[PDB]
């Protein structure tokens, strides 16, 4: 056992060596994770803004298209209004 000992002492050395190592690794993973969360939470905040930016833009467009279509109908009206005057001004010139 005088030798068995030397091998156990060397194992203990190997063992704490790695235990202490894994502890470092864990600590790093721990960071890794916090960074990913921070990094990701941000990217989402970014995206969620661009979205609301668009969302607003789209509502504005929707309204302008509303108005455009209304402006067209008014024009169409007053146009036909003249279609009349013309037809009547014609008859008056074929007498």
């Amino acid at each position: 056992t005088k030798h068995e000992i030397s091998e156990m002492n060397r194992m203990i050395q190997r063992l704490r060596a790695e235990i202490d190592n894994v502890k470092k690794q864990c600590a790093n993973l721990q960071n890794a994770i916090a960074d990913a969360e921070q990094r990701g939470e941000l990217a989402l905040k970014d995206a969620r803004n661009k979205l609301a930016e668009l969302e607003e833009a789209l509502q504005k467009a929707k309204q302008d298209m509303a108005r455009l279509l209304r402006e067209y109908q008014e024009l169409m009206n007053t146009k036909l209004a003249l279609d009349v005057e013309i037809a009547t001004y014609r008859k008056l010139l074929e007498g």
């Binding site: 894994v22 993973l29 990217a43 668009l54 455009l68 402006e71 024009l75």
Partner: protein, 90 residues
């Protein structure tokens, strides 16, 4: 034996650590994909809206052109009426 005991206890402690580490690794992968997906999803929404918006903007342009067409007719008619209202008293 008392030596063998503390060596074995260390063998066990290494295992704890080793486990704790493994689940920590998987937890990290989990986190990473999670955000990856969540992001991908919003990216897609933005895509849809961008194109929804673009499609609309294109149609507003088409509308404006149509209005122009109509308007050109309208003003022209005004100039016919003008020459009619001319020939009558002239």
């Amino acid at each position: 034996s008392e030596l063998r005991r503390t060596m074995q206890n260390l063998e066990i402690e290494l295992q704890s650590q080793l486990s704790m580490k493994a689940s920590l690794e998987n937890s990290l992968e989990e986190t990473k994909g999670r955000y990856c997906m969540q992001l991908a999803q919003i990216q897609e929404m933005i895509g849809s809206v961008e194109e929804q918006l673009a499609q609309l903007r294109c149609e507003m342009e088409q509308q404006n052109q149509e209005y122009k067409i109509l308007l050109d007719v309208k003003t022209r008619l005004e100039q016919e009426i003008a020459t009619y209202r001319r020939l009558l008293e002239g």
